[PDB]
Design an enzyme around this catalytic site. Structure first.
Site, short mmCIF file in Angstrom:
data_model
loop_
_atom_site.label_atom_id
_atom_site.label_comp_id
_atom_site.label_asym_id
_atom_site.label_seq_id
_atom_site.Cartn_x
_atom_site.Cartn_y
_atom_site.Cartn_z
N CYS A 380 0.85 -1.19 0.00
CA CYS A 380 0.00 0.00 0.00
C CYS A 380 0.88 1.24 0.00
CB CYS A 380 -0.95 0.00 1.20
SG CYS A 380 -0.17 -0.30 2.80
N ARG A 385 -1.79 -1.48 5.43
CA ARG A 385 -2.91 -2.20 4.84
C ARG A 385 -2.45 -3.45 4.11
NH1 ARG A 385 -5.16 2.61 1.40
NH2 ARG A 385 -2.94 3.15 1.60
#
Ligand SMILES: [Cl-]
Ligand SMILES: [Mg+2]
Ligand SMILES: [Mg+2]
Ligand SMILES: [Mg+2]
Length: 424
Positions: A380, A385
């Site tokens: 990410c 994430r």
């Protein structure tokens, strides 16, 4: 409520018009033998709809999101048929009239090897609050064969996330302990060795990680300070890469602990120091992909980069972060929309922050060619994430999954690297 027999259910397994619904906890659904059953997991093909969700106003929208329609023939089961009564009634109140309850899941179905069951292959890395309570209480628990543990409350430069309420006896770890705010990558092996020792962690210590969700707000200077459970899974990735052999994540984080009704502490627990981590760092380097290898993976039919970002980030409308300048995307990566922004994982979580029903994740991933036969590097902005997406794939037993640590931050910090922008 009408009943369905064991022989009937077996005969219907695989019918596209029968919806089997497991009303037990998500952790039991995943494989945890929460009542000492011989075989854990769910009936093959079943969906997860924990009865705990009946107290939440979102219940009906969740049912509809899971594509459970009133014309469907619904079969509920739990540990006992009594555990299904409220769910059945709630279905009937909402126009679902073809609802049956399967009474014999436990112990008849669980106890008989001939009746098909499914489970999260590595479910015991994703622990329920009851398991953490037993561990801290020194009680006998399944899926545990150690004598040394630590519960770690993760946060990004926000000790008040821990001091405002934490699992009893837990110590806090700033995500800055294991990752650099300069590279936004995992720290060097020598830094990691000292940081883990100063938090009392050896390679043979069972580490239980969790964080507190405090509603990240993109207007704030440090929204990540409120995304505590993403931070916890990010630290889980770094610890597993470093060489902690037994790392657990509390499913749903702090929310699952307080929802279970367990005690909350505000004590500032002093950290213990261990003299030696006890393993070479990193012991699992294959979990981490850096930019040279990520470029190689973009060129291979055998592998792919998986972009776990929001749509405005993906089309280069925003960078997503108040500390990343460039907006754009890495050419050739597969888009796996995370959710609404850089600090939320709605597409990978239930409303209570537990991991989304893993069958739904694998189904959505398959539609984009995100499949276990490939070596996949999730990424990410800086790896938070991506670590949570990676962890979900790890839990499903996928054999070749990594995090491309550098992410968009490292990629765009080199002006030689090509990039794309706009709607594809
Ligand atoms: Cl979070
Ligand atoms: Mg009512
Ligand atoms: Mg990084
Ligand atoms: Mg952050």
């Amino acid at each position: 409520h009408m009943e369905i027999t064991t022989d009937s259910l077996l005969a219907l397994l695989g019918s596209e018009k029968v919806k089997i619904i497991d009303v037990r906890s998500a952790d039991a659904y995943n494989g945890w033998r929460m009542r000492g059953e011989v075989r854990g997991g769910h009936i093959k093909g079943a969906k997860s709809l924990p009865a705990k969700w009946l107290t939440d106003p979102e219940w009906l929208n969740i049912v509809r999101f899971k594509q459970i329609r009133p014309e469907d023939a619904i079969v509920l089961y739990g540990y006992t048929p009594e555990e299904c009564e409220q769910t059945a009634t709630r279905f009937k109140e909402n126009g679902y009239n073809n609802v049956s309850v399967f009474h014999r899941f436990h112990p008849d179905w669980t106890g008989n090897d001939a009746f098909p069951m499914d489970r999260l292959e590595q479910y015991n890395r994703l622990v329920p609050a009851e398991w953490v309570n037993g561990l801290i209480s020194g009680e006998e628990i399944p899926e545990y064969d150690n004598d040394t543990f630590i519960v770690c409350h993760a946060h990004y430069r926000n000790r008040d996330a821990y001091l405002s309420g934490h699992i009893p006896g837990a110590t806090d770890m700033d995500t800055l302990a294991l990752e650099s705010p300069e590279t936004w990558n995992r720290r060097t092996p020598e830094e990691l060795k000292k940081a883990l020792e100063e938090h009392g962690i050896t390679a043979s210590t069972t580490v239980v990680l969790y964080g507190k969700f405090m509603h990240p707000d993109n207007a704030d200077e440090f929204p990540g300070s409120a995304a505590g459970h993403i931070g916890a899974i990010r630290l889980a990735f770094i610890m597993m890469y470093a060489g902690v052999e037994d790392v657990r994540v509390l499913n749903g984080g702090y929310q699952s602990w307080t929802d279970a009704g367990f005690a909350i502490s505000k004590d500032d627990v002093p950290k213990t120091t261990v003299p030696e981590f006890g393993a070479p760092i990193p012991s699992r380097p294959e979990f981490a992909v850096d930019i040279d290898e990520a470029k190689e993976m973009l060129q291979s039919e055998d592998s792919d980069l998986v972009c776990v970002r929001s749509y405005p980030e993906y089309i280069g409308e925003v960078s997503g972060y108040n500390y990343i300048a460039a907006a754009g995307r890495i050419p050739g990566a597969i888009f796996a929309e995370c959710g609404s922004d850089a600090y939320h994982m709605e597409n990978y979580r239930n409303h209570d922050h537990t991991t989304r029903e893993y069958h739904e994740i694998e189904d959505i991933w398959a539609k984009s060619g995100i499949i276990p036969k490939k070596h996949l590097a999730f990424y990410c902005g800086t790896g938070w994430r991506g670590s949570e997406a990676w962890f979900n794939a790890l839990l499903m037993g996928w054999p070749r999954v990594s995090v491309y640590d550098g992410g968009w931050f490292e990629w765009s910090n080199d002006p030689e690297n090509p990039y794309e922008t706009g709607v594809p």
